[PDB]
Amino acid sequence: QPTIIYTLTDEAPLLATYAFLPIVRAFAEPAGIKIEASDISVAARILAEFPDYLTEEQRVPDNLAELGRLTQLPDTNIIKLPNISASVPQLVAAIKELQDKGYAVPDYPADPTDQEKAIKERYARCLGSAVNPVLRQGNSDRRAPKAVKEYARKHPHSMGEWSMASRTHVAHMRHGDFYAGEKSMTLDRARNVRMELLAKSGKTIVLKPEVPLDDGDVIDSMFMSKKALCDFYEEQMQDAFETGVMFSLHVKATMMKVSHPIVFGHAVRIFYKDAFAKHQELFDDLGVNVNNGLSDLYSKIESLPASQRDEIIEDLHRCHEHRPELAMVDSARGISNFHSPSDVIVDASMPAMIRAGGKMYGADGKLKDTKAVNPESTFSRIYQEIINFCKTNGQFDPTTMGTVPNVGLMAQQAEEYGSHDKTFEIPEDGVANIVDVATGEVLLTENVEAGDIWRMCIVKDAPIRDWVKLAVTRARISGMPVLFWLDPYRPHENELIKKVKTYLKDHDTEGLDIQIMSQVRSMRYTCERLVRGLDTIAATGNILRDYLTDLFPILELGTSAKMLSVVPLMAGGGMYETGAGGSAPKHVKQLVEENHLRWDSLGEFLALGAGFEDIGIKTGNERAKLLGKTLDAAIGKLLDNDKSPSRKTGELDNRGSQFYLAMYWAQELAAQTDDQQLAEHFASLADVLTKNEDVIVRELTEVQGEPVDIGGYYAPDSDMTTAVMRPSKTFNAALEAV
Ligand SMILES: NC(=O)c1ccc[n+]([C@@H]2O[C@H](COP(=O)([O-])OP(=O)(O)OC[C@H]3O[C@@H](n4cnc5c(N)ncnc54)[C@H](OP(=O)(O)O)[C@@H]3O)[C@@H](O)[C@H]2O)c1
């Protein structure tokens, strides 16, 4: 019997799931589809990491590992909702919540003894992007379905106006970064390699004892110079200061050492260098680590009195006299860009800024132009290109702009997403080599200094072949041209270009428009096509998959959540991600304090539809196909009637939107002529929901406008949460009536 695995994650999509999962079960049941919820929240992965601190009834199965195993089975069907890639501050808050709820888990040891070392290494498995590289055992097919795009045309979202006199720009390192020192090769034979450091002292230091590589694999060695980074930060801060432009920092602190986000910490320390020069000793003696953001500092600071503490505060603020204005995460609560490494994440933050007309919030609460610092230049030039494009051509127009589907290479922890266990902080000056364990042959070499970050990346041949095949597939299906975003001046992408040229001859590409251009040129070409209403498929790497699928859909649709995101698993299974965005922690706020969830579940709906249709196609379950068809049509009706959630408290939210979806779905099922008994089963529900529409709607807007308790954040209580998320007794009783 068919099983759909439905992920329980964190925050907004979690709450939405508390309001929607009962609906899904009530619809999947008549079709003999089991709905199996899998808790992969941060709290859950924590508990699953530490069972030897837990009781009998407290313990939790390693659900992530289970899903991992499931990815290798043909009959697997996963609805993946966005989940938190926890930073250390978030991990800490979560741990606090658990312990306070009586789960007595060990504290996180920032500075460890030898047991606490081990528990830190264990807690590392709960840090950063721990889910997606496991689940993503196929390449990415992301695109906006035509009904969604047409809704976007009929009801354009707010788009910030772009000034030709905008001073907004991207500052990135022009030397000393991963890009500049990158080296790359394609293996001709299977090899086993070692990442080691030839210290100038003569001593060899091994950082990675063994990395198995396959024939045809593309590997890269890259490093970021600490000297170059810190100098870069200094010069950019001074430029921003002199020009009077607001400083912002846009990085992925999780694609780095999640325990030691060096790129972030250095920015913080250099910004406040005048303060840090005066309290270095006390900060060290306090265990201060601004790699986990300025927040960390503040925490360690609280134990102090208010004489040498307010002196610190005064020094930190004194630093603002010589440093530029600083972009804010929350102007109301005084949350700056430096507060936490995870607040401002490049993939979401840059598009947000571009959508705003090149602007972010300063301390005063106003939108201003910004120097958007993306230290790593590898994938940030494209942002400067689209920014100059907006400065020149004004903001985009969702009513007329074309679309940019993405075919993303990500299968088997491809590239930088798989380099978590091959990323090191260089301990001392010397030569960083990748050597054959058998021959001792140096495959790749870099000259590195102490404090540098050295990374090895791998992308395997089979995912590349499937990536090209998916590109061609999508080109032939959609009739859109395909553009491979590959910079031949980047060694990795050059190797990939060889791959693509080779594998394009393994498919009928006759009458297909398939080109390869550099990332910047590809971005430019794509925009020039966009403003003309022309479509272009972006066939890209993993990072670019992330970046572009946040950027373009936000411009086109207001949010990347309204996207179709299908991962055809290598083993034949299916994963369907509910959009391309994250867990939207800002929505949780408005919910807990105003009982309005502005989370759009359209991504869940689309993903679910694709899932049902695929189950139907694979198993020959006609009823599954019927659920697919009827759900897609019901989504069409949801869009036609603009029953999407509103931002405003007191107006339609996630729950009412879900209700309308249920209604339309029921109607579509009562109207179909393929399964009479099914039509009969859903006729009753359809009539009940259609009859009591105003009653249920009213029941859903009643509760709106008042603070609400879900009994937690990282581990909210199921019953309280379900009490809040399903407050319509009428609706609930209608669903319970089967
Ligand atoms: N695939 C994944 O699992 C995945 C991917 C990316 C990020 N994440 C995680 O998500 C967390 C937060 O990421 P972030 O704050 O950088 O970006 P984000 O979660 O995408 O949220 C940024 C903004 O996008 C809009 N948005 C996102 N999803 C929406 C939806 N379903 N309906 C309506 N609007 C939506 C919201 O804007 P408004 O405030 O204007 O409504 C939201 O504040 C991070 O911890 C990150 O690790 C997970």
Swiss-Prot record:
Q: How does activity depend on temperature?
A: Shows almost similar activity across a wide temperature range (20 degrees Celsius to 40 degrees Celsius). Retains only 5% activity at 60 degrees Celsius.
**Entry annotated with the keyword NADP:** yes
**Known catalysed reaction(s)?**
D-threo-isocitrate + NADP(+) = 2-oxoglutarate + CO2 + NADPH
Q: Broadest EC class?
A: oxidoreductase
Spell out the molecular function terms from Gene Ontology: isocitrate dehydrogenase (NADP+) activity; magnesium ion binding; protein homodimerization activity
Q: Which cofactor does it need?
A: Mg(2+)
Keywords recorded for this protein, A-Z: Glyoxylate bypass, Magnesium, Metal-binding, NADP, Oxidoreductase, Tricarboxylic acid cycle
Listed InterPro entries = Isocitrate_DH_NADP_mono (IPR004436)
Report if keyword DNA-binding is assigned. Answer: no
A GO biological-process term: tricarboxylic acid cycle
Q: Report residues binding NADP(+).
A: N83, S85, G582, S583, A584, H587, R598, D600, R647
Matching Pfam families: IDH
Q: How is the cofactor bound?
A: Binds 1 Mg(2+) ion per subunit. Shows activity with Mg(2+), but not with Mn(2+), Zn(2+) or Ca(2+).
Q: What is its EC number?
A: 1.1.1.42
| S-S pairs | none
Stated pH dependence: Optimum pH is 7.5. Retains only 10% of activity in acidic pH 5.5 and less than 40% in alkaline pH 9.5.
Name the residues that bind Mg(2+).
D347, D546, D550
Q: What does this protein do?
A: Catalyzes the oxidative decarboxylation of isocitrate to 2-oxoglutarate and carbon dioxide with the concomitant reduction of NADP(+). Cannot use NAD(+).
Q: Which family does it belong to?
A: Belongs to the monomeric-type IDH family.
Looking up PANTHER family in the UniProt record yields: ISOCITRATE DEHYDROGENASE (NADP(+)), ISOCITRATE DEHYDROGENASE [NADP]
Description of how the protein assembles with itself and partners: May form homotrimers. Also forms homotetramers at low salt concentration, which are dissociated into homodimers, but not into monomers, at high salt concentration (1 M).
Protein name (record) = Isocitrate dehydrogenase [NADP] 2
What species was this sequence derived from? Mycobacterium tuberculosis (strain ATCC 25618 / H37Rv)
